[PDB]
RNA sequence: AUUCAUAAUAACUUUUCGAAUCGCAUGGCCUUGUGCUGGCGAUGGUUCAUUCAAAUUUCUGCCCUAUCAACUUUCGAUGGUA
RNA sequence: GAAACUGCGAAUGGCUCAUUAAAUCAGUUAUCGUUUAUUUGAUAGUUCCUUACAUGGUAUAACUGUGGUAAUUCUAGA
C-alpha cells in the first residue's frame, strides 16, 4: 500500500466486537482517536450491536446527529469514534450512563452507571514528563494530557480524573496489594490483587496477581491496570466482579 | 537518478541480489549543493512531511563563535584553506561541514577592544589570549572550523579554532604545503 | 426574506428564532389522534400510561412512582386532589425539560378530569406556568414554549365557562406575560387569551373591554 | 482628463499651473456657507396619532413633516432655498487629484517650484498618500539641482530619508540620487540594496566593515556618511516586536562601532537633535513650556534606549559629547521627575512611561560613568548632574534604595571609588554621603 | 491571414482579412510584444499603432511568448502558464505550441490598438461595450467613486435593474470586506478570550507552586 | 542507560507563527454615543503528547543441485575517518 | 442555486501472482536512529521602545465579446 488503509474486512476485525460473519464484508474501521485500534469500540458497534437502539448505520447517524450521545462529557458525532476502556457514554433522553469496561469472557461490557459515578473517570498514568516552559504533565492511557500533576504521580499509577473540568481529583499508587484490573492478554477481565512485580531490565516486567479465590496468574505491566485498594474498587465492577471459573 | 536503497549492493557473503521492486520514493537522494563563496543564493527544497530544507548555492557571510569567550559574531568568509575529505573541494572553494576557512577578524578584535580596553598585537589575566590567536589577529584573518551543514540548513556557522585544534591543523597545513 | 423556496435536502438548520416565528398555538387548528380524548378509562390515567411508556427521565420516573401508587381510578383522583397537584407543581418548579413535556400534558388532562373543582388550584397553577415560561426564555427551547402555551390553551379550553364568567381576573393574571418585554411571549399569551376572548359573550366582553382600556391608560408609558 | 491633459497643457501651461496650485491650496482653505438664519419658532405638535402598522406610520410621518414645515414656514423657507441652491464644497481628495496631475506633468512644477516649497518647508496636514505622490514627483524632476531652494530641499529631503517608513526612504533616496554627483553615482546600487530588506545585514557586513573589499574610501566616506547614518537611523527606529526585528536593530548598533569618532558623534547628534535641551540650558533648570506629553516622553524613551544599546556595544571607545549626549540625558531624567511630580496618579500610562524613563535614564547614567569615568572632564556639568541627583533622591534615598544595588547606588559607589569624582560628595553638605550612611 | 484587432479602451474588437503580402512582410520577423505601423499595414489605419499580441497558425496551435522559434515546438508546460489548463493538481503535460516570431503561416494574428489614428474605424473606434460588473470590495467602491473615508458605502453600491415580465427588480452585490458591528464583536471576542485564558494559566500555575512549596515545607 | 526532557546565555535567518475569516442570536451597561461590553460554534494555527500509519531493524526457520569447491574486490567486496 | 475559484479526496477499495530462494513471509525484537494529514487532549496577553485597525493591496477564474483548427476534457487575444 502507498498510504494509510481506510477499510477493514469483516474477519479482519477484532474478535471481541462480536460481529457476525454474514451481514457484510466490512466492519466499522474505528477512526483515529484516544484509544488504540484493536481495543476500541466504535459507537456504531455500541449503539447497534449491543444496545439495539439502532438497526442501521443510518439510524446511528440519526442518533449522533441528533446529538444525544456524549462520550466523556462531550458530544460526539462521528459514528466510528473509538470509545475504549473505562469510558463514560451518557444518553440523556434514555437517562443512562455507561461505563465501558471488560467482562470476564474477554468482551466489552455495558455497565449501567448513575450520575455521581459517571461524573469521574479513571486513567492509567503512563508517561510523566516535563513540557515546554518547564511545566510537568501526565499522559494517561487515553491521550489525556494533564498539566501540573501531583509530584508523587509516577508511571503505571491510576489517576481519578474529574471529567467536567478535566482535572486530577486523586490518585492511587502502584504497590503490591492494590486491586489490579487486567486489560490485555489471555486473562483480560480478571480482577485480582497484585502480589509481586517481577522486574527485568530491558525486558518486560511481569506481574504476579492473585484473586479472591486465591488463584494466581502472571501478566505484563502493559496489561495491568490499577483500580483501587484491597476490596475497595473506586469504580463499580461488572457482575461476577471479574472471576474466571469452571 | 540518485537512490539510496541497500538492495542493489552485494550481499554480506559476497552474493549478487536480484531485483525485488522498483525504486521507491522514500529512499530518494538528491543532488549535492556544492556551496561556493559568492553573493547569497539559496534554494528551498520540499521534503517528507511538508518540511522545508534550505540549500545554499553561494553564501558569503556566516556566523562564527569564539568558544573561549563564549560569544558569536557575523563575519565574512574569505576562502577555504583545508578540508579533510577532498583537496578538490579546497581547490574549488566548496563550503561544507568540517571545512577550515579563514574569516574576517575585525568584529572579533573590535569586540575585544571594547570589552577589555586593550588593542591586539604590537583584568590583564583575562585580557591574555593565546599566541597563535594573537598572530592570526596581527595577520588579519582567523582560522575557523565550520560546524554547520550548509547544504541542509543553508547557514554557515562555525567556531574559531582554539588551541589544540589550531595546533593540529597548523601542523596539517604546514606539512601539506 | 424568510426561507421561501424549500430545498431538496431533508434536515434544515432552523435556528431558535426561526422556529418561534414558525410556531403557532391553536391545537384545534392542529389535530391528531388525541390519546386522552381517545381512550376514556380516565383522562389522567390514560395520558399517564402513555407517558410512562414514552418517557424515560429521572424526574418523571420519580413522579411516576409516587402518583402511580396514588392514582389508578377516578375516585382516587377526586379524593387525593391536593397531593397529586402539589407533586406536579413540585416537579414543574424543578424545571427539567426532558420531564417538562409529560408534566405539562398531565397538568392539562388533570384539569380536564378535575373540571369545575380546579378553580382553587387554578391560580397558583397559572403562576407556576408563567414562571416556567420566563425560565424558558433563560434556556431557549421552542419545545418548552410550545408545550407550556399548549397547556395554557388546554386549561382555558377546559375551563371555558368559568373563566369566561370571570374574564378580568384571568387577564389580570396574564398581564405579567401579556405585557412582557419579549415579542414571542406577548404573541403566544395573546393568542391563548384571544381564544378565550372569542369564546366570551357580549356583556362580560363589554366589561373586559372597559377594564382593559382602563389598564391601557394605566400603562400609558408601556407600548408592549 | 488624466490622459487628455498631458497633450494640451503645452498650449497654455500657465493657467493649468494656476489651477493645479489652486487645487493644492483648496482643501486647506476654509469654506463657509453661513447663510441667513432667521429667529427660531417653536411650531410643533403631534398632529396625528402614532401608529404601529408601518405604512400608516410612513404616511403619518409624511404629513407631519409637511405640517412641521408649514408651521415653521420661515426656517423651512430658508432650508428649502439652501437645498435647491445646491452645494459648492470641494471634495477632500481634490488635492490628491491635482497631485496626480502634477505627477503626470513634472516639467511645469520643475519650472515654477516657488509655490510648492512652502509646503515642503512647513512639512505639511497632508496625508501619507499625498506625501508619497509628491515625493514621486520630486523624483521625476529633471533639473533638480537648479530648483528655487536646492539645499533646503536637500535638507528636508535628508530628513525624510531619515524617516522610518521604508517606502518614504525609497522615495527620498531616489530624489537624493536625482541630485547628481559621481560619489553617489559610484555607490548608487549599494544604498539601494541597503534599503532592500532581504539584503540588509549581508550588505552591512559586505561593505560597511572596515578594511575589506568594496569598502568606502576616505573622501567618499566624508561625502556619504550623512546618507548612511540617516538610513541606519530609520532601520534603528524599526520597533522590536519580533525576533527578526530585534536582530535587525542589534545588527545596526553592532556595526556602528567601526565607522569613526565624529561619525559616531554625528549619528548620536541626530538622535539628540530630534529632542530639545535648549529649554533647560537657555534657562538653568526650569522648563519653559509644560510639555509633559506622551509624544515628548516617547521621544526621550527612544533616545535612551538607543543610547543604552550604543553604550553596551561601545563600552569604552565611544565619544561623549556634552552638546549631544549628556545634556539630553539629564534633560530626560529631569523631565521624568517633573512629570512624576506635576501630574497626578490618575494618568496611569504617562506615569508608567515616566517610571520606565526614570529607570532607563539612571541606568544609562550609571553605565556611562562605569564606562568612561576619569577619561574626560566633568567640571562643566558636575553641578547640573548633581542637581538632577539631589532634587528627588537624597531626601528618601535610604527609604527607597535598600533592597538591591540600584543604578543610582552603583553610580554613588563609582563616585566614591574614584578620587577625582569626590566633588559631588564635596558639592553638597555631604548629602549623598549621609545618604549612604 | 486574419487580423483580430482589439481596441482595449472601448473594449471593442473586430476582424479584418488580409490578402496581399506586403503588409504581411511588414509583419514578418517581428515578435509578440513589439510594435508595428498602421500606415505600413494599409490606408485606413493611417496614424494607428498596433502591438503584436498573439495569434494562431494554420492548424490552430497558438503563439506563445518566451520561445523565439518561428516554428512549432513541444514544450513542457506547467501549472501557471498560458496555452494550457491543467486537469489535475501537479500535472505537467507536454504540448505543441507555435513560437513567437511572426512568420507567414499564421492563420490569425491578433493585435491591440495602442494609439488611435486619424480616421474612425467602424466597429473598433465608434462603438463600445460597458464593463460587466462594478466593484465588490468596500475600498474598491471608495476608489471607483472617490468617496472619502468618512462616508459610507452601502448608500453608494451600484445596482442593476433586472426585469422579468412585469416585476421590475434590482440587484446589488454583498460588499465584501465591510466593517460591521459583527466584525467588531468578533475582534473583541478574540481579545477577551486571550486575556481570560492567560489569567486562568497564571492562576493554575500559582496554585501548583503553592502546593509544591507546601510539600517542601512539610 | 544518554550529549534525554527542560532551562539559560550570545548572535544568526532571502524565514515561520503570535486569527484583516465565517453562522445564528441578541443580551448587559451607562458618561444617550448609532459609545463601551457580551453568548453559543464553524474554520484555522506554532509546539508537545496521542492515534491511524510509514521506513528501517535483531534472533531463528526455506524445495532440487558437489559430474557445481572456491567466491567477492578496476566497476564498493569487508572495515576506519571526514 | 447552474457555472467557476477555494478546501479535501482521488495513495483506500478491486484484480493478478510475472518477478524474487535468507529475498518475500511466520513468530520474535528495536527506534536512546526517524517522518506522520487526520482524530483526541493540552498549548501562545510578550506593556513600552522617536517621522489606516470601525479592519490594507493586487490580481485572475466563471461571465461578455473577437477568433483559430479536419480533429481532442485544445484553447489565444480583449
UniProtKB/Swiss-Prot annotation, chain A:
Entries under InterPro entries matching the protein: KOW, Rib_uL2_dom2, Ribosomal_eS4, Ribosomal_eS4_C, Ribosomal_eS4_central_region, Ribosomal_eS4_central_sf, Ribosomal_eS4_KOW, Ribosomal_eS4_N
Alphabetized Pfam families for the sequence: 40S_S4_C, KOW, Ribosomal_S4e, RS4NT, S4
Keyword set, alphabetical order: Cytoplasm, Isopeptide bond, Phosphoprotein, Ribonucleoprotein, Ribosomal protein, RNA-binding, rRNA-binding, Ubl conjugation
Modified residues (Phosphoserine): 31, 246
Placement of covalent cross-link Glycyl lysine isopeptide (Lys-Gly) (interchain with G-Cter in ubiquitin): 61, 133, 160, 167, 173, 178, 210, 232
Entry's Gene Ontology cellular component terms: 90S preribosome; cytoplasm; cytosol; cytosolic small ribosomal subunit
Keyword hit for Lyase: no
Family label: Belongs to the eukaryotic ribosomal protein eS4 family.
Any further remark recorded for this protein: Present with 573 molecules/cell in log phase SD medium. There are 2 genes for eS4 in yeast.
HAMAP family linked: Ribosomal_eS4 (MF_00485)
Subunit and interaction comment: Component of the small ribosomal subunit (SSU). Mature yeast ribosomes consist of a small (40S) and a large (60S) subunit. The 40S small subunit contains 1 molecule of ribosomal RNA (18S rRNA) and 33 different proteins (encoded by 57 genes). The large 60S subunit contains 3 rRNA molecules (25S, 5.8S and 5S rRNA) and 46 different proteins (encoded by 81 genes).
Protein name (Swiss-Prot/TrEMBL): Small ribosomal subunit protein eS4A
Source organism of this protein record: Saccharomyces cerevisiae (strain ATCC 204508 / S288c)
UniProtKB/Swiss-Prot annotation, chain C:
Location in or out of the cell: Cytoplasm; Nucleus, Nucleolus
Subunit structure of this chain's protein: Interacts with snoRNA U3. Interacts with MPP10. Component of the ribosomal small subunit (SSU) processome composed of at least 40 protein subunits and snoRNA U3.
Homology family: Belongs to the UTP20 family.
Entry function: Involved in nucleolar processing of pre-18S ribosomal RNA and ribosome assembly.
Official protein name in the record: U3 small nucleolar RNA-associated protein 20
Protein source organism: Saccharomyces cerevisiae (strain ATCC 204508 / S288c) (Baker's yeast)
Gene designation per UniProt: UTP20
Parent sequence residues shown: 4 to 227 of 2493
From Swiss-Prot, chain D:
Species, as recorded: Saccharomyces cerevisiae (strain ATCC 204508 / S288c)
Superkingdom assignment: Eukaryota
Subcellular location: Cytoplasm; Nucleus, Nucleolus
Subunit architecture: Interacts with snoRNA U3. Interacts with MPP10. Component of the ribosomal small subunit (SSU) processome composed of at least 40 protein subunits and snoRNA U3.
Family to which the UniProt record says this protein belongs: Belongs to the UTP20 family.
Role according to the record: Involved in nucleolar processing of pre-18S ribosomal RNA and ribosome assembly.
Membrane spanning residue stretches: none
Residue ranges of HEAT repeats: 148-185
Designated name of the protein: U3 small nucleolar RNA-associated protein 20
UniProtKB/Swiss-Prot annotation, chain E:
Keywords, in A-Z order: Cytoplasm, Isopeptide bond, Nucleus, Phosphoprotein, Ribonucleoprotein, Ribosomal protein, Ribosome biogenesis, rRNA processing, Ubl conjugation
Compartments where found: Cytoplasm; Nucleus, Nucleolus
Residue positions where Phosphothreonine is found in the record: 163
Pfam families: Ribosomal_S6e
Alphabetized InterPro entries for the sequence: Ribosomal_eS6, Ribosomal_eS6-like, Ribosomal_eS6_CS
PROSITE patterns, A to Z: RIBOSOMAL_S6E
GO biological process: maturation of SSU-rRNA from tricistronic rRNA transcript (SSU-rRNA, 5.8S rRNA, LSU-rRNA); translation
SMART domains for the chain: Ribosomal_S6e
Covalent link Glycyl lysine isopeptide (Lys-Gly) (interchain with G-Cter in ubiquitin), residues: 116, 131, 149, 214
Keyword Cell cycle: no
GO CC term (a single one): nucleoplasm
An annotated Gene Ontology molecular function: structural constituent of ribosome
Superkingdom of the source species: Eukaryota
Keyword Signal: no
Subunit structure: Component of the small ribosomal subunit (SSU). Mature yeast ribosomes consist of a small (40S) and a large (60S) subunit. The 40S small subunit contains 1 molecule of ribosomal RNA (18S rRNA) and 33 different proteins (encoded by 57 genes). The large 60S subunit contains 3 rRNA molecules (25S, 5.8S and 5S rRNA) and 46 different proteins (encoded by 81 genes). Interacts with snoRNA U3. uS11 interacts with MPP10. Component of the ribosomal small subunit (SSU) processome composed of at least 40 protein subunits and snoRNA U3.
Similarity annotation: Belongs to the eukaryotic ribosomal protein eS6 family.
Misc. remarks from the entry: Present with 66000 molecules/cell in log phase SD medium. There are 2 genes for eS6 in yeast.
Name by which UniProt lists this protein: Small ribosomal subunit protein eS6A
Classification lineage: Eukaryota, Fungi, Dikarya, Ascomycota, Saccharomycotina
Gene name per UniProt: RPS6A
Amino acid at each position: 500500500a502507498r498510504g494509510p488503509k481506510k477499510h477493514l474486512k469483516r474477519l479482519a476485525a477484532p474478535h471481541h466486537w462480536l460481529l457476525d460473519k454474514l451481514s457484510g464484508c466490512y466492519a466499522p474501521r474505528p477512526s483515529a482517536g484516544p484509544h488504540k485500534l484493536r481495543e476500541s469500540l466504535p459507537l456504531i458497534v455500541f449503539l447497534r450491536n449491543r444496545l439495539k437502539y439502532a438497526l442501521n448505520g443510518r439510524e446511528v447517524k440519526a442518533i449522533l446527529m441528533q446529538r444525544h450521545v456524549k462520550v466523556d462529557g462531550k458530544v460526539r458525532t462521528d459514528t466510528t469514534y473509538p470509545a475504549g476502556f473505562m469510558d463514560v457514554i451518557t444518553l440523556d433522553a434514555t437517562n443512562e450512563n455507561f461505563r465501558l469496561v471488560y467482562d470476564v469472557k474477554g468482551r466489552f461490557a455495558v455497565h449501567r452507571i448513575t450520575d455521581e459515578e459517571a461524573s469521574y473517570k479513571l486513567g492509567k498514568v503512563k508517561k510523566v514528563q516535563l513540557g515546554k516552559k518547564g511545566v510537568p504533565y501526565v499522559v494517561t492511557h487515553d491521550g489525556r494530557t494533564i498539566r501540573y500533576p501531583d509530584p508523587n504521580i509516577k508511571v503505571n499509577d491510576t489517576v481519578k480524573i474529574d471529567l467536567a473540568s478535566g482535572k486530577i481529583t486523586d490518585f492511587i499508587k502502584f504497590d503490591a496489594g492494590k486491586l489490579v484490573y487486567v486489560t490485555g492478554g489471555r486473562n483480560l477481565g480478571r480482577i485480582g490483587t497484585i502480589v509481586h512485580k517481577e522486574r527485568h531490565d530491558g525486558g518486560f516486567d511481569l506481574v504476579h496477581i492473585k484473586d479472591s479465590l486465591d488463584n494466581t496468574f502472571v501478566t505484563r505491566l502493559n496489561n495491568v491496570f490499577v483500580i483501587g485498594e484491597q476490596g475497595k474498587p473506586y469504580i463499580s465492577l461488572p457482575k461476577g466482579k471479574g472471576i474466571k471459573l469452571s | 537518478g540518485i537512490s539510496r536503497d541497500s538492495r542493489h549492493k552485494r550481499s554480506a557473503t559476497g552474493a549478487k541480489r536480484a531485483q525485488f521492486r522498483k525504486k521507491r520514493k522514500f529512499e530518494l537522494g538528491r543532488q549535492p549543493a556544492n556551496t561556493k563563496i559568492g553573493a547569497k543564493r539559496i534554494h528551498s527544497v520540499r521534503t517528507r512531511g511538508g518540511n522545508k530544507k534550505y540549500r545554499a548555492l553561494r553564501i558569503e557571510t556566516g556566523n562564527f563563535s569564539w568558544a573561549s569567550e563564549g560569544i558569536s559574531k557575523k563575519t565574512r568568509i574569505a576562502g577555504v584553506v583545508y578540508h579533510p575529505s577532498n583537496n578538490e573541494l579546497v581547490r574549488t572553494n566548496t563550503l561544507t561541514k568540517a571545512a577550515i576557512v579563514q574569516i574576517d577578524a575585525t568584529p572579533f578584535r573590535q569586540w575585544f577592544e571594547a570589552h577589555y580596553g586593550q588593542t591586539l598585537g604590537k583584568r590583564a589575566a583575562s585580557a591574555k589570549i593565546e599566541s597563535s590567536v594573537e598572530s592570526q589577529f596581527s595577520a588579519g584573518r582567523l582560522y575557523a572550523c565550520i560546524s554547520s551543514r550548509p547544504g541542509q540548513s543553508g547557514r554557515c556557522d562555525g567556531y574559531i579554532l582554539e588551541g589544540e585544534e589550531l595546533a593540529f591543523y597548523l601542523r596539517r597545513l604546514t606539512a601539506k604545503k | 426574506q424568510r426561507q421561501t423556496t424549500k430545498s431538496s435536502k431533508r434536515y434544515r438548520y432552523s435556528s431558535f428564532k426561526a422556529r418561534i416565528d414558525d410556531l403557532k398555538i391553536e391545537p384545534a387548528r392542529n389535530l391528531e389522534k388525541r390519546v386522552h380524548d381517545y381512550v376514556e378509562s380516565s383522562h389522567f390515567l390514560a395520558s399517564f400510561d402513555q407517558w410512562k411508556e414514552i418517557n424515560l427521565s429521572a424526574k418523571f420516573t420519580e413522579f411516576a412512582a409516587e402518583i402511580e401508587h396514588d392514582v389508578q381510578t377516578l375516585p382516587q383522583i377526586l379524593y387525593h386532589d391536593k397531593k397529586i397537584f402539589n407533586s406536579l407543581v413540585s416537579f414543574i418548579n424543578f424545571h427539567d425539560e426532558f420531564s417538562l413535556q409529560p408534566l405539562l400534558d398531565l397538568l392539562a388532562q388533570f384539569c380536564h378530569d378535575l373540571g369545575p373543582d380546579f378553580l382553587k388550584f387554578y391560580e397558583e397553577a397559572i403562576k407556576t406556568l408563567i414562571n416556567l415560561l420566563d425560565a424558558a426564555i433563560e434556556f431557549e427551547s421552542s419545545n418548552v414554549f410550545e408545550w407550556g402555551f399548549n397547556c395554557l390553551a388546554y386549561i382555558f379550553k377546559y375551563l371555558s365557562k368559568f373563566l369566561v364568567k370571570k374574564l378580568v381576573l384571568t387577564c389580570d393574571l396574564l398581564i405579567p406575560l401579556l405585557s412582557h418585554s419579549k415579542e414571542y411571549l406577548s404573541r403566544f399569551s395573546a393568542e391563548a387569551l384571544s381564544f378565550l376572548v372569542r369564546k366570551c359573550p357580549v356583556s362580560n366582553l363589554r366589561e373586559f373591554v372597559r377594564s382593559v382600556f382602563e389598564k391601557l391608560e394605566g400603562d400609558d408609558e408601556q407600548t408592549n | 482628463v488624466f490622459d487628455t491633459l498631458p497633450n494640451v497643457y503645452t498650449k497654455d501651461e500657465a493657467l493649468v499651473w494656476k489651477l493645479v496650485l489652486s487645487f493644492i491650496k483648496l482643501p486647506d482653505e476654509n469654506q463657509n456657507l453661513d447663510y441667513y438664519q432667521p429667529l427660531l419658532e417653536d411650531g410643533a405638535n403631534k398632529v396625528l396619532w402614532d401608529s404601529s402598522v408601518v405604512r400608516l406610520r410612513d404616511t403619518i410621518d409624511t404629513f407631519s413633516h409637511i405640517w412641521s414645515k408649514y408651521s415653521t414656514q420661515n426656517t423651512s423657507i430658508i432650508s428649502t432655498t439652501i437645498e435647491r441652491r445646491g452645494n459648492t464644497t470641494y471634495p477632500i481628495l481634490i488635492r490628491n487629484q491635482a497631485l496626480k496631475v502634477m505627477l503626470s506633468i513634472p516639467q511645469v512644477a520643475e519650472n515654477h517650484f516657488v509655490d510648492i516649497a512652502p509646503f515642503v518647508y512647513n512639512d505639511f496636514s497632508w496625508t501619507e498618500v499625498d506625501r508619497n505622490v509628491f515625493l514621486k514627483t520630486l523624483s521625476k524632476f529633471k533639473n533638480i539641482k537648479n530648483v528655487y531652494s536646492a539645499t533646503e530641499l536637500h535638507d528636508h529631503l535628508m530628513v525624510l530619508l531619515g524617516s522610518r517608513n521604508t517606502d518614504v526612504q525609497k522615495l527620498a533616496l531616489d530624489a537624493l540620487l536625482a541630485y547628481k554627483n559621481p560619489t553617489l553615482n559610484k555607490y548608487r546600487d549599494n544604498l539601494k540594496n541597503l534599503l532592500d530588506d532581504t539584503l540588509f545585514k549581508d550588505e552591512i557586513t559586505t561593505f560597511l566593515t572596515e578594511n575589506g573589499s568594496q569598502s568606502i574610501k576616505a573622501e567618499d566616506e566624508k561625502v556619504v556618511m550623512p546618507y548612511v547614518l540617516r538610513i541606519f537611523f530609520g532601520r534603528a527606529q524599526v520597533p522590536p516586536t519580533s525576533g527578526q526585528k530585534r536582530s535587525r536593530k542589534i545588527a545596526v548598533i553592532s556595526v556602528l562601532p567601526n565607522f569613526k569618532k565624529p561619525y559616531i558623534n554625528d549619528f548620536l547628534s541626530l538622535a539628540s537633535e530630534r529632542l530639545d535641551y535648549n529649554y533647560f540650558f537657555g534657562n538653568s533648570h526650569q522648563i519653559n513650556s509644560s510639555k509633559a506629553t506622551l509624544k515628548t516622553i516617547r521621544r526621550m524613551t527612544g533616545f535612551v534606549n538607543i543610547v543604552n544599546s550604543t553604550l553596551s556595544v561601545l563600552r569604552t571607545n565611544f565619544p561623549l559629547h556634552t552638546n549631544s549626549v549628556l545634556q539630553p540625558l539629564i534633560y530626560s531624567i529631569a523631565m521624568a521627575y517633573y512629570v512624576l511630580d506635576t501630574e497626578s496618579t490618575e494618568e496611569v500610562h504617562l506615569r508608567k512611561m515616566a517610571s520606565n524613563l526614570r529607570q532607563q535614564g539612571l541606568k544609562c547614567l550609571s553605565s556611562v560613568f562605569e564606562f568612561v569615568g576619569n577619561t574626560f572632564d566633568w567640571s562643566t556639568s558636575m553641578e547640573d548632574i548633581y542637581a538632577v541627583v539631589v532634587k528627588p533622591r537624597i531626601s528618601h534615598f535610604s527609604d527607597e534604595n535598600l533592597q538591591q544595588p540600584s543604578s543610582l547606588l552603583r553610580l554613588f559607589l563609582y563616585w566614591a571609588h574614584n578620587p577625582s569624582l569626590y566633588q559631588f560628595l564635596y558639592y553638597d553638605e555631604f548629602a549623598t554621603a549621609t545618604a549612604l550612611m | 491571414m486574419k487580423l483580430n484587432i482589439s481596441y482595449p479602451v472601448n473594449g471593442s474588437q473586430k476582424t479584418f482579412e488580409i490578402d496581399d503580402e506586403h503588409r504581411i512582410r511588414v509583419f514578418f520577423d517581428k515578435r509578440i510584444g513589439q510594435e508595428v505601423d498602421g500606415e505600413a499595414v494599409g490606408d485606413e489605419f493611417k496614424g494607428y499603432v498596433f502591438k503584436i499580441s498573439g495569434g494562431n497558425d494554420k492548424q490552430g496551435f497558438p503563439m506563445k511568448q518566451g520561445v523565439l522559434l518561428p516554428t512549432r515546438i513541444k514544450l513542457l508546460l506547467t501549472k501557471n502558464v498560458s496555452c494550457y489548463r491543467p486537469r489535475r493538481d501537479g500535472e505537467r503535460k507536454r504540448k505543441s505550441v507555435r513560437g513567437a516570431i511572426v512568420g507567414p503561416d499564421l492563420a490569425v494574428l491578433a493585435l491591440v490598438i495602442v494609439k488611435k489614428g486619424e480616421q474612425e474605424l467602424e466597429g473598433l473606434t465608434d462603438t463600445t461595450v460597458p464593463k460587466r460588473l462594478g466593484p465588490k470590495r468596500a475600498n474598491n467602491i471608495r476608489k471607483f467613486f472617490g468617496l472619502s473615508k468618512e462616508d459610507d458605502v452601502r448608500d453608494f453600491v451600484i445596482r442593476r435593474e433586472v426585469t422579468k415580465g412585469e416585476k421590475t427588480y434590482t440587484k446589488a452585490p454583498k460588499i465584501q470586506r465591510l466593517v460591521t458591528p459583527q466584525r467588531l464583536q468578533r475582534k473583541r471576542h478574540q481579545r477577551a478570550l486571550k486575556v481570560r485564558n492567560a489569567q486562568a494559566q497564571r492562576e493554575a500555575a500559582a496554585e501548583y507552586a503553592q502546593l509544591l512549596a507546601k510539600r517542601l515545607s512539610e
